[PDB]
Paper text:
Throughout this study, we used recombinant bacteria constructs of human [name] lacking the C-terminal hyper-variable region and the Rgl2RA consisting of amino acids 643–740 of human [name]. To purify the complex, a mixture of GMPPNP-loaded [name] and Rgl2RA was applied onto a size-exclusion column. Crystals of the KRas4BG12V:Rgl2RA complex were obtained which diffracted at a resolution of 3.07 Å. The space group was assigned to P1211 with four proteins per asymmetric unit (two molecules of KRasG12V and two molecules of Rgl2RA) arranged as a tetramer. The complex forms a 2:2 heterotetramer where β2 (within switch I) of KRasG12V and β2 of Rgl2RA generate a continuously extended β-sheet, along with interaction at switch II of the same KRasG12V molecule with the second Rgl2RA molecule. KRas4BG12V residues within the switch I interact with residues in β1, β2, and α1 of Rgl2RA. These interactions include a salt bridge between E37 of KRas4BG12V switch I and R653 of Rgl2RA. The switch II of the same KRas4BG12V molecule also contributes to the complex formation by interacting with the second Rgl2RA through residues in β2 and α1. Meanwhile, two KRas4BG12V molecules have direct contact through switch I, switch II, and α3. Importantly, the V12 residue of the oncogenic [name] mutation is in the proximity of the ring of Y32 of the neighbouring KRas4BG12V, contributing to the KRas4BG12V: KRas4BG12V interface, increasing the hydrophobic pocket.
Ras belongs to a family of small G protein that switches between two states, GDP-bound form (RasGDP) and GTP-bound form (RasGTP), and regulates a wide range of cellular activities. Ras acts as a signalling hub where the RasGTP, but not RasGDP, physically interacts with multiple Ras effectors, which then transmits the signal to downstream molecules, including ERK, Akt, and small G proteins [name] and RalB. Activation of [name] and RalB is mediated by guanine nucleotide exchange factors (RalGEFs). There are eight RalGEFs reported for humans, and four of them, RALGDS, Rgl1, [name], and Rgl3, have a Ras-association (RA) domain responsible for Ras-binding.
Numbering used by the authors:
A (entry chain A): 642 to 655, 658 to 734
B (entry chain B): 0 to 167
C (entry chain C): 647 to 734
D (entry chain D): 0 to 102, 104 to 167
Write the structure that this text describes.
């Protein structure tokens, strides 16, 4: 008589030699931006990242993109019509 | 316009599919354990004089994500079937993996290479004898690798490519 | 796409375990999940076509998941607790 | 009836917490790796002559499910902190686990450190630096092995001993 809340979502996240195109990543209803950044960054073996340097931004269809606010709940922040994100820095 | 090859790496959890792929593409091995869901890699490289773009798919070993398997097995061109020499269970799992590859896009001749992954480890729980014997019965290649020392990594991947173009 | 974590209890003929937490994708059908929990348990020998996955709801109310259903969309969503039983 | 002890096994990914929990009950070691989210077990057994039912919680190592840490740490009585002898990273991870447990609201919580891969040849952390940490935490330290079953009983029982000690 009504859907239950979802626990997790799978997202794909894409600086540097992009040997990998993307990595599938699990994000809980509880995750803030830093959690996700360090997660993907640790997958990428880039231990030295402070996590506060990087930014996770969603790419919507029609060549339109949006940056997810840091220290915010990515599960609720994302448009939910994408699933595809990317990580970038700031020299 | 260059030749595109779509490789897909399958195997039990922990056999070291992610590790081998990361080795071929990024020339390094980290000991870190990190369960994978679906990792996609794209790299251009010349093989036997042929410029081609490799589309490698680093799949999950956990059933949880095998809900995707019918799609990625459809799309994939060649399949790298991995077990760990220390994990006997992985070796028995190969049977199931191959049958699944056969059943999707019904064909009994599909480009595959069997791989035994942790050959640097002392344990050795499965003989290469019974592995090469399987490969002979499957009539496919068999390479023992180590993602750690990088032994066989090039050999394994490139062989699958060779097998693929052989089946135009 | 979205997923849920559920806990499922076995038929538990022997002492075994209390429950096992399990992840189910928006893509999973009942057989997928039943074989998953079956392999988690020491019933590698068991066929999944035989077993039945039953959600436990408040008020001692149960719901049996149809063999063919997508559990992610089927479940009542007032419970994350299930049970696996013979259906023999 | 029976004394109830609620143990919870924590540690980094792959350290072998699942393996040794499953070794405790119906005694076996399966080399198959299967990442756990949260597995609950229950077994009755006598310790130092005391019949008691163990409520063991086999937790996840993957960050993905640390969202559950605040709940399982609340409920749990005693904590088995596991690292792998081969993974130095796991050993450093224990810091984080303990401090999260400390934040039950106590500087003393019933816990026991364990190094699970005592059978592996390629030790990256010595017992010296391990028992030295345990001394600073003022808790026991047992080197276990889920494969050979060495120390599994010892380790679990010790946590029980630590629990009854704690009141
Ligand atoms: N010594 C050694 N360790 C290896 C080798 N291949 C992988 N490993 C290690 O074994 C573990 C599993 O590797 P990984 O690539 O994540 O396995 P996987 O097959 O991708 N597992 P998953 O299905 O979850 O993605 C890691 O600790 C990795 O470092 C190898 O050839 N030798
Ligand atoms: N040789 C040896 N292998 C071990 C030992 N403990 C665990 N392993 C192996 O290491 C792998 C990880 O085991 P497991 O208990 O699932 O690890 P975990 O700590 O539960 N991982 P997770 O955080 O995902 O729950 C398995 O292949 C297991 O057989 C040990 O003491 N010795
Ligand atoms: Mg992996
Ligand atoms: Mg586990």
């Amino acid at each position: 008589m009504g859907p239950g809340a979802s626990d997790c979502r799978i997202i794909r996240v894409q600086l540097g030699e992009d040997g990998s195109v993307y990595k599938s990543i699990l994000v809980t209803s509880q995750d803030k931006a830093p959690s996700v950044i360090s997660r993907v960054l640790k997958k990428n073996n880039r231990d030295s990242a402070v996590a506060s340097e990087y930014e996770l931004v969603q790419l919507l269809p029609g060549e339109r993109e949006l940056t997810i606010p840091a220290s915010a709940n990515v599960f609720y922040a994302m448009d939910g019509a994408s699933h595809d994100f990317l990580l970038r820095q700031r020299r | 316009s260059m030749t595109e090859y779509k490789l897909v790496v399958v195997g039990a959890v922990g056999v070291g599919k992610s590790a081998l792929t990361i080795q071929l593409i990024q020339n390094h091995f980290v000991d870190e354990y990190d369960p994978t869901i679906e990792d996609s890699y794209r790299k251009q490289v010349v093989i036997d004089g042929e410029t081609c773009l490799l589309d490698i798919l680093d799949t999950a070993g956990q059933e949880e994500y095998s809900a995707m398997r019918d799609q990625y097995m459809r799309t994939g061109e060649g399949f790298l079937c991995v077990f760990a020499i220390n994990n006997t269970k992985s070796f028995e799992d190969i049977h199931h993996y191959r049958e699944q590859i056969k059943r999707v896009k019904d064909s009994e001749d599909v480009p595959m290479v069997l791989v035994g992954n942790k050959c640097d480890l002392p344990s050795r729980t499965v003989d290469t004898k019974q592995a090469q014997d399987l490969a002979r019965s499957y009539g496919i290649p068999f390479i023992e690798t180590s993602a750690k020392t990088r032994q066989g990594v090039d050999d394994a991947f490139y062989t699958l490519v060779r097998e693929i173009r052989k089946h135009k």
